[PDB]
Amino acid sequence: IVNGEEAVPGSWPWQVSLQDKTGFHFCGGSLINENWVVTAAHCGVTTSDVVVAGEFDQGSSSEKIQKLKIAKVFKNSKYNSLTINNDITLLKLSTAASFSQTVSAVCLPSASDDFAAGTTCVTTGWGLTRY
Amino acid sequence: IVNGEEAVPGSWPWQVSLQDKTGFHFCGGSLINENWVVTAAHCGVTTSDVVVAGEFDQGSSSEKIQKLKIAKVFKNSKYNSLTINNDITLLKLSTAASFSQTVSAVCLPSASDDFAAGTTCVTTGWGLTRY
Amino acid sequence: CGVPAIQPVL
Amino acid sequence: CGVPAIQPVL
Amino acid sequence: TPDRLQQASLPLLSNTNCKKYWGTKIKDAMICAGASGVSSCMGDSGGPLVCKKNGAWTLVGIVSWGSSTCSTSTPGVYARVTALVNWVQQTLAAN
Amino acid sequence: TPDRLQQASLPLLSNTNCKKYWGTKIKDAMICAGASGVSSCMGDSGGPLVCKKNGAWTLVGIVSWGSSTCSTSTPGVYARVTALVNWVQQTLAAN
Ligand SMILES: *[C@](=O)([C]([C]C1=[C][C]=[C][C]=[C]1)[N]C(=O)[C]([C][C]([C])[C])[N]C([C])=O)C(F)(F)F
Ligand SMILES: *[C@](=O)([C]([C]C1=[C][C]=[C][C]=[C]1)[N]C(=O)[C]([C][C]([C])[C])[N]C([C])=O)C(F)(F)F
Numbered sequence: 142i143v144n145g146e147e148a149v150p151g152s153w154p155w156q157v158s159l160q161d162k163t164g165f166h167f168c169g170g171s172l173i174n175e176n177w178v179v180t181a182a183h184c185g186v187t188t189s190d191v192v193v194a195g196e197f198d199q200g201s202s203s204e205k206i207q208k209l210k211i212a213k214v215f216k217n218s219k220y221n222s223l224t225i226n227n228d229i230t231l232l233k234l235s236t237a238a239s240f241s242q243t244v245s246a247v248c249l250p251s252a253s254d255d256f257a258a259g260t261t262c263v264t265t266g267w268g269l270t271r272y
Numbered sequence: 273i274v275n276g277e278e279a280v281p282g283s284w285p286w287q288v289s290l291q292d293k294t295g296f297h298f299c300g301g302s303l304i305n306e307n308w309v310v311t312a313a314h315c316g317v318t319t320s321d322v323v324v325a326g327e328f329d330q331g332s333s334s335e336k337i338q339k340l341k342i343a344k345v346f347k348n349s350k351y352n353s354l355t356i357n358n359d360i361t362l363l364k365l366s367t368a369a370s371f372s373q374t375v376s377a378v379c380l381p382s383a384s385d386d387f388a389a390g391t392t393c394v395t396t397g398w399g400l401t402r403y
Numbered sequence: 404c405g406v407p408a409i410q411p412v413l
Numbered sequence: 414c415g416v417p418a419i420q421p422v423l
Numbered sequence: 424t425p426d427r428l429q430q431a432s433l434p435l436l437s438n439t440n441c442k443k444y445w446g447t448k449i450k451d452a453m454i455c456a457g458a459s460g461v462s463s464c465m466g467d468s469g470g471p472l473v474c475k476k477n478g479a480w481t482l483v484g485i486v487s488w489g490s491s492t493c494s495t496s497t498p499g500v501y502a503r504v505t506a507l508v509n510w511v512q513q514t515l516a517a518n
Numbered sequence: 519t520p521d522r523l524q525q526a527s528l529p530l531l532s533n534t535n536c537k538k539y540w541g542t543k544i545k546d547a548m549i550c551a552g553a554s555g556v557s558s559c560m561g562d563s564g565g566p567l568v569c570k571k572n573g574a575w576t577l578v579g580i581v582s583w584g585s586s587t588c589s590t591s592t593p594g595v596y597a598r599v600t601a602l603v604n605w606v607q608q609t610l611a612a613n
Contacts, residue, residue, distance in 0.1 A: 142524040153568075168562075246405075250599055252604055254576070284421060284428065355450060385481070390530060395461075396428060
């Protein structure tokens with residue numbers, strides 16, 4: 142995120158980090174419950190990637206993080222890789238996340254919900270902070 | 273403004289301050305040219321009020337400000353004081369503002385312009401900074 | 404869901 | 414009109 | 424009021440979405456913005472709401488009213504300049 | 519990428535206003551936000567766009583794509599969760 146602000150640790154409890162065997166943070170994801178991860182399809186997750194939960198600082202050696210194995214990758218077949226339309230993949234965990242003060246689920250909308258233009262919403266991430 | 277940021281001095285060149293004989297900043301206004309001030313009708317301007325231009329800090333004794341007399345108050349008669357509908361008054365100056373690096377006019381839209389929802393616009397002021 | 408145990412402060 | 418001689422920085 | 428000139432960036436909303444907050448109070452010559460984590464407050468009235476269009480800053484609203492309390496979760500109500508601009512042209516023209 | 523978790527508040531825009539920036543690139547299952555002075559960037563993909571509704575944070579977008587450059591004047595494109603949520607319900611249901 143460009144022009145963000147540092148979040149209050151443990152405050153976006155559903156915010157996971159996608160990392161590779163190497164330990165490289167490659168995309169983000171959101172917990173929708175204890176066994177299930179939501180992310181983009183273009184992030185190209187595989188079963189050797191690790192879902193990392195309860196992170197604030199990828200630099201810390203002292204946080205109580207969970208490194209969780211991916212069992213299955215559910216790529217929405219309505220994903221149109223040329224278009225980048227319907228960009229969503231579900232990731233089923235091999236080991237259920239343990240819910241805590243810092244690991245929790247985000248709520249999902251029902252398909253018939255309205256989110257009007259001009260509404261102030263919030264985005265989180267470990268994205269480039271400057272281009 | 274609640275949660276503002278301090279502006280770069282002289283950067284909102286059209287931004288005037290409405291003050292009373294007392295020197296009290298009571299509302300804001302915008303320069304639309306050298307002889308003409310736009311503000312709200314509810315601000316209840318009178319001819320003994322002073323249009324103050326080129327201000328940054330009402331606390332300074334050292335800015336090169338212009339204290340300009342009001343000649344006429346043009347209250348939009350479509351102003352509906354109960355409703356607060358059509359809240360606009362024009363103020364004609366007795367002495368023309370001198371335009372400079374810090375005193376300039378804002379552009380006006382044509383009536384047929386579109387300003388879409390979700391657009392990031394900017395507001396300026398000397399308003400309460402905390403309630 | 405949706406109610407962090409530690410309040411996001413904006 | 415509309416182009417300050419000193420750039421507003423946001 | 425602060426001594427120093429403040430500024431804030433914020434979003435225009437629709438009247439529709441706006442009557443989700445203010446209802447029948449919101450009329451045609453008024454335009455809403457904020458509910459973003461910023462708010463105009465007592466002392467800002469008459470002051471501008473500017474949007475840049477084709478490189479220049481256009482007066483799109485005049486600070487009117489909103490949350491008694493300057494709640495930053497409540498959208499500010501502004502005068503809608505497009506609806507009043509002919510009056511302005513008509514006034515500068517006569518005088 | 520920064521070590522520390524960042525956040526940013528920003529506005530949803532309409533698809534319409536959104537094709538004022540991205541045009542035919544903007545499809546039905548995508549939702550736009552930003553162009554506010556903030557931008558999502560490389561490294562944010564898959565991450566959330568949350569809006570609070572009736573006291574709780576709802577997943578309204580999934581960080582998808584935008585300005586090659588993370589321009590903060592260019593709106594970010596996100597996945598639109600309302601359009602994909604039945605697929606999610608259908609998936610959790612089967613497995
Ligand atoms: C204006 O500076 C204030 C501005 C204000 C207050 C709250 C939210 C946004 C902007 N205006 C008022 O207090 C007005 C006055 C009438 C209704 C137009 N009313 C309210 C409550 O918003 C001031 F009037 F000079 F203080
Ligand atoms: C994503 O983190 C980035 C995110 C991004 C970049 C710019 C603006 C907003 C968000 N996504 C990309 O780089 C994507 C990839 C395909 C098109 C979905 N494309 C672009 C250009 O936005 C990342 F892919 F992990 F870096």
